[PDB]
């Protein structure tokens, strides 16, 4: 039940995803979901915020 | 050094739904507020017979 986890995630968004981005300095923000019934996945569907 | 070596090795979340029921509605409401001056008229109509009963007495 407890795992320190880590993993490597992609950026789907379209936009950007092949952009082949040129010389220069960007800043480069994004925003991760902490909310469990978003980020996981179980097999019965049940809540796991409760 | 070896043997083992081939594998390897917060505060607040603050949630709010909890272990309760489920909920339902409905939109038929409040007959209620007319209720309350019904029953305090007819609280006076009580005190305004009893009335009735000491102005005749009284003659």
Redesign the interface.
């Given at each position: 039940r407890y795992v320190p986890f880590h993993i490597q995630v992609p950026q789907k968004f379209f936009a950007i995803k092949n952009l082949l981005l040129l010389p220069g300095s960007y800043t480069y923000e994004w925003n991760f979901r902490?909310d469990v019934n978003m980020i996981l996945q179980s097999s019965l569907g049940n809540?796991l915020?409760? | 050094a070896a043997a083992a070596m081939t594998a390897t090795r917060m505060p607040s979340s603050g949630s709010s739904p909890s272990v309760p029921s489920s909920i339902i509605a409905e939109e038929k409401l409040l007959a209620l507020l007319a209720e309350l001056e019904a029953l305090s008229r007819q609280l006076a109509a009580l005190t305004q017979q009893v009335s009735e009963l000491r102005e005749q007495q009284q003659q």
């Open positions: 902490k809540d915020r409760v | -």
